[PDB]
Amino acid sequence: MHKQTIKEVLENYKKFLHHDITVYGWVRAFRSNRFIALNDGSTINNLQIVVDFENFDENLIKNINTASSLKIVGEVVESTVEIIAKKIIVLGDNFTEELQNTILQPKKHSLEKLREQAHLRFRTNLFGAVFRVRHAVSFAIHSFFNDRQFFYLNTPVITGAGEMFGVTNFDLDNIPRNEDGAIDYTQDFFGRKTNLTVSGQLEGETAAMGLGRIYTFGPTFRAENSNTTRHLAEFWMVEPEVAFNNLEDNIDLAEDFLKYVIQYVLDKCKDDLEFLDKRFAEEQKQKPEKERAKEGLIEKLENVVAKRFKRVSYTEAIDILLNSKENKKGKFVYPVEKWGADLQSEHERYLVEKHFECPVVLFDYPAEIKAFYMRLNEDNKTVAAMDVLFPGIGEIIGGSQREERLDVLKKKMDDMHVDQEELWWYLDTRKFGSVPHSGFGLGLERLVLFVTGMTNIRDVIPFPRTPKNAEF
Template sequence: MAETDQAPPPSDQLAAMNLTDTVEKHAFSDRVLIRSIVGRPDGGAGLAGQRVRAGGWVKTGREQGKGTFAFLELNDGSCPANLQVIVDTGLAVLSKLVATGTCVVVDGILKVPPEGTRQKIELRVEKVVSVGEVDPAKYPIPKTKLTLEFLRDHLHLRARTNTIAAIARIRNALAFATHSFFQEHNFLYVHTPILTTSDCEGAGEMFQVTTLISESEKLEKELIKNPPPSEVDMEAARQVVSERGEAVKQLKAAKASKSEITASVAELNKAKENLSKLEERSKLKPGIPKKDGKIDYTQDFFARQAFLTVSGQLQVETYACAVSNVYTFGPTFRAEHSHTSRHLAEFWMVEPEIAFADLQDDMNCAEAYVKYMCNWLLDKCLDDMQFMAKSYDKGCIDRLRMVASIPFVRISYTEAVELLEEAVKGGKKFENEVKWGIDLASEHERSPLLFITTQRE
């Protein structure tokens, strides 16, 4: 992160600033975020005696004392840690509270639990405000650890798990940090379109956006209910037009009254209009419209082919040539069939563009951004990263610290190839042959702290 001119206060003063005697309420609710209680350096002990309203979902619950009270581990998603809540039997039917997934809102007093317990603070409930019951037999998210494959079948509830909630908080922090970094460095945020007619990558891996299919399906259903006119119907309509036209001629020849002629002309126009409608309906064909053997995109929503964006680079570059330093940050779509960690159908991408800059400037920006993001996670999401380290990747925090603290190495393409060739001589094996002139593959770019400063010449 960027250094400030003013040194931070001593740690004892900082602690005094953070630990207040009043718990912070949510800005738009009477509820207090659980994070503002258990996320304090003292674990919430300094808030003992405070009356608060807490709401969340029961992670675990159990009745104790032969049903005289219940312990609830309550979580509202604001942090990984739970708040222990104690409810007496006189306040609610305890059996309706203890099931995992139950939604509760309670009022109570924060108290320091007895010595020897894991919690630093607990909530003694004085009033149960509301209860959203669940059926334990049907609730699909038990308190046991679940696989990610299982959670994909329960998308509407998976955010209640520790893993998905932690991912959501981490992604939120990274998105906020992205905007913070670029705003602090005077970049302008540009909203580039999601729907586009441009292919910035040129690789033909775009998702197409069209209404032709749905319109074709609607037309097929409509034609089944109301078939297009037959040739007999068309001939009958033409005959009516001919007869109405002849009638008008006869009236004019007979010098009939103006009102008679006007009425006859109106009938003729009506017959012509009906014939025109029948002719248009007779042209309707089931299936996607085609012209000269090709799909007729002039009948599509945008009257031409349209796609989900693969990159906002083309659009954001036009702004860089007008307002200097810009960036775009949003969803990107790639219709690639490669099932690897490097290929996703949908992902969010950061694309900065700097006017009047060279390759060194670009590398400086990229390095500063990556370090900023790593430091932000270590500062703002350490508890979630600790959960990830414990559950999925033991070395993730160490890698963040390494990337944040070590300067990125910058070498030329030729030097990179020479290093890889030395690795091959030392016994390292690559699927792709290493020689000067190749495009470096992902297996050649394993070091996270490396920039290639020049292309092959």
């Protein structure tokens, strides 16, 4: 027997008019002893079940409560579509006394309470929408790269290479040691010290030279003691790498990618986005007007798709910021530093939301504040970096054209004290038909924040990992 979801029933009911069908779900509400609002997660929308209590046992009706699980057989009718229940089966326990202690209680719950009951928040209107939209973002990403001849590469998570989490098989109460008295990592599981990776990029470059176009889509980890509304210790990164792309090609790719994925969500998530759009707008009204966003959620997404990204050099951005009235008359919370420093989130957001009123790609950053692998530009002062800036979230993509010249790369590694012998294999990629090549990394959670209108990064991943929080 093949089962149909509530989404299918709401979409195909005209075929079933006056037929008996079978549906399964949880009670959102059972009102006036007559109307069940039933949900199964396939859609934000509920299916109405009409219940004539005189045709059912009194003990059964009393067991229809908020969050109860039901199997229902009944006739498809129009009020619009609803089921006239003929049989109702309770599918499992519902300890209604304890429901008051959960976020399943039908009342407003704070976001941090929902966060506190992350194992249960999937059953709310809000997070059904958020996580169905997160699915659509993910599948849009795989579809975009699949259709343009990229190959999904599962780069390693455990690495022997930002502060990193150690990964060990040692009993921490019984660590083996060598002659000198140091920890003997030759006795750890991998015969060397290991950590969780911060990025699969270096492995992606090795594969780009055999497969042309690759992307990763996997977890990455940062051990910075950072407790902020936008930082996770465990998060998912999407990192394409393309042989024969230069920096300009890399920016084109990033722009095409973001616009495609956002349009996909606009196409495929209309009901969920409408809810999230209403939620965002009500959220805005509680704010003071100076903190209110100029655009609604869907409006913002449509205009990101429509607007060509502004491409601005690092050097031009610094000058704009230095000479802004906000810097000169002390309106920025953080001072604008001279050429050579990295930009503050406040100044990035200024550029996007106020100065340009448009997504901005910044590029050609001072070499000393960027990673060793970034290609050194002819000016011998900047590297071929790029950062894509979105309103509200700030940076949404970072990447660069890579340094494909062996001699130049070795000098950049020496300059930033990167061990060449431990990366012997990465240097090999510059020895045998080295190619100009470029990639970038997308923080998947940051993109989900952007398309769902949510503000806290803990509310766009199922079970967030942050300082002192690793529950569930």
